[model samples]
Target chain A: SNEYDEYIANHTDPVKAINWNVIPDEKDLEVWDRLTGNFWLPEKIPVSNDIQSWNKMTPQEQLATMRVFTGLTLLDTIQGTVGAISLLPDAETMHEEAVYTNIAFMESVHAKSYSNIFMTLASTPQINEAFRWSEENENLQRKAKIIMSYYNGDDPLKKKVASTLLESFLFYSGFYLPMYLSSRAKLTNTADIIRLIIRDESVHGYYIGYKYQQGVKKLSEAEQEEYKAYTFDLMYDLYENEIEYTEDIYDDLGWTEDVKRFLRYNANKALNNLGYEGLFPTDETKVSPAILSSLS
Target chain B: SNEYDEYIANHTDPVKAINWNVIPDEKDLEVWDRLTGNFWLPEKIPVSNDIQSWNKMTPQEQLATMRVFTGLTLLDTIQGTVGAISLLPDAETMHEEAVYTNIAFMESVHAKSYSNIFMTLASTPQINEAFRWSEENENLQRKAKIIMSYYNGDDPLKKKVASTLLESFLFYSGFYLPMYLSSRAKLTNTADIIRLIIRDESVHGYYIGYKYQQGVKKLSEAEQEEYKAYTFDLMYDLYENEIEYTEDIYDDLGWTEDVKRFLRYNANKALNNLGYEGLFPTDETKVSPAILSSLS
Candidate 1:
């Protein structure tokens, strides 16, 4: 069998070009516009301006930042190549598949942006060590492995569930440091770049989740319930791994507790984006206002 | 066993975050910068400006333009999802994979730009009929099927050869119309958009061809000769099919011979990009200065 038959398993017709004029879903158009309109490059952000902030930080703080950014890079790399590319075969419409192309490319942009930050702020040795840490770190590897497993699986809806969690929930743990650094008025330019990434992820999560909801509509009520159950179970699995990851990355910064709150808050949002009720308690998920303000 | 293992067959290590700071190949960094630096959107172009020019065309001319564009769109669609995405798994470096992401996204952009032009200049029925024609056209399907066979195959060098040909050779037949129209000052805005796509394909062909040469360097002399032989054989096969496709689309417009000359010119360039001698006779491949000037 050819790649088309392998990937587009259920379809007999060859893939068609995306027709924006005859949109299959209006939301696909909206998201496509929102994404392309929000197109950005790391070079545009003047991340070199953060050099002063980088020099002021202690070795521990610098190490934490480098490690966190590298972790973020790994997720973006996977999402760019595997997660987004896998979804194309299963897209219900040509427009939706095209949207995933934008998402995939932006993820590559996001992945490379971390390298841009490293080149500006860290020494070559430091940058190399952080990338090593990303590969060797148990929690980081676990989360990547978990997400990649679903990306490789047969179930398209499960892939969407995993991708949404990655977009909205999995990333926030690493995202917290940049926003926190910005809150303290350090590395604000770097934070600006991260904010751009956050904006894109917000759209990615919502759109994938929205598509997931539409897919669920075609199933029997019992089948739909089963998917919801699968989503929550998968989220909980990823959430547990993410908590460990957050604590591992943030413990030395003394921000583990605050970051956990941030993670839970985004986890709830991830569920909400997927059209499910929040799993974390409202009282337990209150993130720091300083971080919340940076997101806006 | 996992997605990582499957896609990244040679590497036992999990895919690392692409570190632009530590580029494995300088060409990857250069191409990435060139591509990202030249990022564009179809919305930025006023294809609506072409409406008057489009209106001046006879019904036959209009039908030919639409059919040519729809045919181009199908190839772009295949490249965006299958061709570029398939190359990711064989990439020798993370940065190379990253470059493929840009290529894939831009292919999607190219595919969608055709729709943008269609919406601006053609009736719904005209657009729909053109799309149906793309599917039914034997020569178009033959070329797509031929390129896709390599994209789905195991030989990385052959894949690059096929990809470079698609970037440089297969596309020029369909690309000829817009450049021709622009030479006559018709559909100049739509031609502006097509020029952007041509610019991108130029980079894609060069980079992928450069990488293919690099891969050839690792082979024994006998193996290298075999690859070169394979490349020429494949090019001749595709050249034959492209001639048929050009004649089919351009026969009504009375531009078939001119378009064939353009195809031979690009086919030779495709070979030169792969570090091989051009196959076409010099006199036969001389395209109109008007079409060549519009490219600059």
Candidate 2:
């Protein structure tokens, strides 16, 4: 049917480029306070027996967890729209750049929050084992358009990363949204912070939509074909990962019926927001960070 | 000028039908669960200056309160949609009536819970004071709705009292949803009981939504006008007596912002959610309950 063909087209693109460098601003701090003031992390400690230790962590430690929390939080927000973005090629530059920058921004904040929280609590810090990005560098390098584009911005590197980055985005957004929603709501100190970050992710999605129009109409023909193949790969990886994580996180959190419901909302928003739009720059979502699939 | 013209031609109606004698079943219980689930009440109970006592009443009194508590808990679930229903004529028969009845059903359960709790908690022949109904005046929203609806019904006074009786449904929801989401989240000791009762509230909300939507289209032109007028009379009358009832309740609970926001959100939903149309039947300047909102 025309449906699968169209959907298939929307799946390629660069993963979100987490701007490990875009330092949060004063306004970010103001919003940060709001998040910290109304923490949801403590709510989950009892509900999920596995995370009992996570709850026992000091509030300061809980606050620290938000750093990774931010990075983790926004993946689905981007993944959902990857399919639509892929189909729309004219969005190449703007969508690519925005996804990259927001990812970078979240990564930086997440890192900072985690450090600060643990330093304050003198608690053992959270581990990086949750992700597997290191071992799959080559595969990721193939997909990490936004990150590599920014990291290695020269011509050949840009060309290489562009196709990979595009594919990366599709996989990222699809996987991340629900995970973040569930994680954020369960957070101790950073739930509010995660919310603020989620709000920003939505804004980033708006940015991609703007680019979608531009990409589809303006990109060169050759680039369009490159993007098409990239999208198909993106969709394959995403669907595969979604199946993997549903069981993973579900078992991890032992979520309440409500929490599970929220997770579905996140997942549905991730996939449906793009609708029938072609892939590349997603139509409605911010690029989900490619970190999940990029993980080995 | 355009809005005024539209107002003249388009109108909404409030519930005029009477079917309060109906008792609840499992369908009713399921909705109670869903609606109450939406309250998002907090799980923690931070000790405050107001912690002079826990629940204030004696064990005997507490038992009686439980009956009212569960019933009201269920009604508050409907609280999210009732205010929205009051303004639109199309919603009056289907949505509003459903909201009111759903609330009444929850109230009935809570009434029962309290009765059983009272019977067990108090050892004596009875509990007291809570059984006393508010003297009819401008202060009670339910009383006003009951009292005002009398003008058109075959037997207005009985109808009025009957409506008030139905209000246990709405009232229980407001109290129960919040108490469940927040205070009860901390029911660390009574987890099993909490889970069971909450399960009931969830089902209750679903039924309310399902039944409310069964005949969800607009009422006839004349019915719309009459319903609109009826809702307005009751609301304003409520404004006089129960204007800040929620706030007062919040005040009783120490007035935390999260609690306030939670309550407001629930209150607004009860008023607005027939399809989330966002058009206000009474205040054209505002949003309506059951339809899609162009502005929204």
Candidate 3:
């Protein structure tokens, strides 16, 4: 499809970062194996037998895929929140805090939704236990450290504003794209619950985008330049950190090219949505040749 | 004294809040005042005064005046640096922690300079003991507390910057005036020192006024009304704080009406230096109405 081609064209991933077919967080590798191993895709629907085959896959099978998505959204939200509030001092703080607080909420909602759905389908607690561990032990302190460090520095205003914009971009490119694709393709169970979570994130992300754009405009010429410099560095740093972290989570999973492509290909599109056409603007105000040579 | 005044009038103060006074620690304070306070003062003898006789005054008198001038200078430098940096977020972190670092430096320089001078001229450490007791117990510490409380804000850097500009006017009108009066009258040996310091601070005052005017010019009519609310609240708070603080310090001294008159006279002169013409700059009275009523 053109959609697949479009995404692939944008994402020039030289290497596969994640594998979807076989995935497990290191702590629960054994338990997940037991849970998913028995859950085979049914050859046909029970009611409309032999007419068509769609997986009536066990709860474990559905959950395994869902967890992959949960991981991606978690990463997106972290990135989303950071990028949203990263540009403005005031909005950066409020938005970033909201993201974390909302994240805790989302995680809980997700855990509960998964529980209701997981119980109805799962044969064992082992799969459920794996999901529980991932959610609970997700230490937010490291993320908080990054947020605090940004505020603690000499340019809180710029950091906050730039963060908001970038986060907005990540949400659009990374989070929504995958969710929409999965939902449209009927890839998983709990579509209703997933849609609700997406709705909330979309609302939150929309405002982040609005405020991010508004705040960045208030920055004077020199401030804009300074913001550009920090944001440029941050985008690269965040990309490196997220890739490394995600790779660790997904390395045990068999690398699926489709999933790998989904993880990356929209980097530039995301940045573009955040109102940065190039990595850096050639001219913000009163075009200068110095800025032209400086663009990435 | 006029020599110091002339020197002050010519030399410019930078946008930095770097004070010639201020040490970060108690130990650092001890060494700096002797070197910085005396050494940083202008080389040429401004006014003809006998150094021996000048040293003969009760050490309390000299220290009291120096402490006052240092506090006065403290207000300006903090204000100046904050303003300069606040102009560009790339310029300063308005967070309280960052402000705390700068505040600590100012306080240290202040403590060091005053402590060194008292230690220098006092017949014994006991004399300085009295000076020390008064200083530690003084309202100035309370004043530092008040100002610092204000600096702790959402945008601390901007708060400090705005407060600096506001205080610059107040300091010029209140404390700056008194210092000039004492020096011009040859009331204390410390006058020469105050004059030297004031010269540096006045340039800061000038730059702030310059930048403020620039800021005002950029505002749209609607924005002017809206922002002016923020501006006047800040300005009047500083104005009232200064006037009260000045009055409190003077009340403690219990000086004569003539001295009060003299102080007022010098204060009026300070007004002139602020670029207001005539006794008051009210339109009907051949003076600018903005000058006298303005908290700015």
Candidate 4:
């Protein structure tokens, strides 16, 4: 915004001020509207349904639930602070700055929702320590390293495109695990909660696709290939790490086949959304009839 | 938030994640609670009284009101985008980041309140032209120059602390003008509206004062004096600019002397808040009976 201020000061063009009522660009304004309109609070989500659902769980189901949510929380914490917060300063337009800030705020909201899930369903200290454990977990760190490199580097367009990949492809890849287990599995009152998160991240992923298209258009064909390779190599590591992490969480439940199928399905959807061919091509529909039926 | 993320990644000692369930730092946590708790929307404030108040005003009175709000809007415009947005990334703690980001959002809200005022009382074309004219105004531009330097400069801590001084001084300087007029001069529907704004800005100014204190405490004794001098010089420029701007707005309405007195009072208050000696060195308290009476 300061840079925009300076630009307005220096520009000798007769046009005087930034009119908030007028669209400087429709691209970011559209995203800004969606973000502001869809605002939700973690504090408001009625948790009594989830609380009753929590008590009905088996030991394995409880362990799976705890791990899934904690792990998701870690991802969201990084997204809030690192993913969204980091992008604001480099934005070239006021539209970009405004929308990105909202995106960052939404990430914080998602992080709080996970914290809400933990605080409402269980004793906080237990869940608090679980959060700490997950934060320190080696597997999560490894996955984060793959994503963080793209977020931190130079070239605004490249950084933005890389962000699109992270938000659209990678987040959609991993986020589906928890969404399926909690919301889709009908394991807890978390179904509605997870649904809201999906709704938010869904817009983020789609809007980021627009950025990906715009940013990628600037790259030379060779640079494009290099970026694609970069995406592939990073996604390769995450896909591998996720299998191991999911295995650790569901070792007792033995849901490896289902988890793997689900991850590939969402990952492919994410890639397609970004105008890329599927990374982990799969034809098998992993959506359970029960999961689809809930929405109906 | 990312800086802390990396610090955790490298450390092996078993430390828990920041426990949202408990206050890890009562000082920052309390500020964060206040910030999020006091959140208000500009659209929620009804301006029916202000529209009626507008109808009751003389031509000179109406012009002065428009100019005062236009000038106020310019400061808030820079603040929302430049003030809070710039300070956020450098926050050392997640608590700091969260609070500063909220501060930035609140600044945007304040900017919109001015727009809300104009929207309710003035025509779209007239208000739009006022905003455009504001960007090119000499006094406003000079005031912005003093504050933007510190915000856009290097050294995170230095920039942050410098921002504290700038925000506290400038906001305290500009905000109290309308407040003093509305409260001391006469109570209008606009008075209640300005009161809400003053209430919000007071917390912001106070919070920034603490930031100023914390930031300065870290500096060498010599460095503290350097910062003090920096603030004094900046405030002097702002004071000069205000005299000119105030003349333009209130000269016709015959409120020039009162505006100058209120401006000096708030400037001294700003210095006191930052633990500096008063600059203008005035003994006379020009606070109106109406202000005290209204409070009672």
TM-score, predicted candidate 2 vs. hidden true structure: 0.27
TM-scores of all predicted structures: 0.94, 0.27, 0.33, 0.82
Q: Alpha carbon lDDT of residue B126, candidate 1?
A: 95
The models' CA-based lDDT, in order, is 0.88, 0.33, 0.37, 0.62
Cα error of candidate 4 at position A127, Å: 3.4
Descending-lDDT candidate ranking: 1, 4, 3, 2
Residue-level lDDT tens digits of model 4 in A1-296: 13225543664343222344555668776776667667776667677666666677676777667666776665665665666656666655655665666666566667667766777777765686577667677776656654565566655544555566556545543455455555544544566777777777777777766666666767799988886776566557667877787677767887767767766766676666566788764565366655444433
- lDDT computed for candidate 3: 0.37
Every candidate's TM-score, chain A alone = 0.95, 0.41, 0.48, 0.84
Selected candidate, larger lDDT, 1 vs 4: 1
How big is the positional error of residue A256 in model 2, measured in Å on the Cα after superposition?
59
Between candidates 2 and 3, which one is better according to lDDT? 3
**Number of the candidate with higher lDDT, 2 or 4:** 4
lDDT of 3 at A247: 49
Q: In candidate 3, what are the lDDT values of residues B1-296, reduced to their tens digit? A: 12123332343321111111222433323322222233231223333353454465454444445445445534433332222223333221212112222222232232223333333434344443343433453334444434443443344333433544443454443343334345334334444444444444444344334334445456687864654455445444444455555554454444323333433433334334333332323322222223222211
Instruction: Give the CAPRI class of candidate 4.
Output: incorrect
Q: B60-172, model 4: which lDDT tens digit per residue?
A: 76566665577666666566566665666665566565566666656655665676667777777777667766666776666666566656666554455445545555554
What value does DockQ give for candidate 4?
0.20
Q: Which stretches of candidate 4 lie over 4 Å from their true place?
A: A1-18, A89-92, A123-125, A172-178, A181-191, A218-237, A272-282, A292-296, B1-19, B47-70, B89-92, B172-196, B219-230, B275-282, B289-296
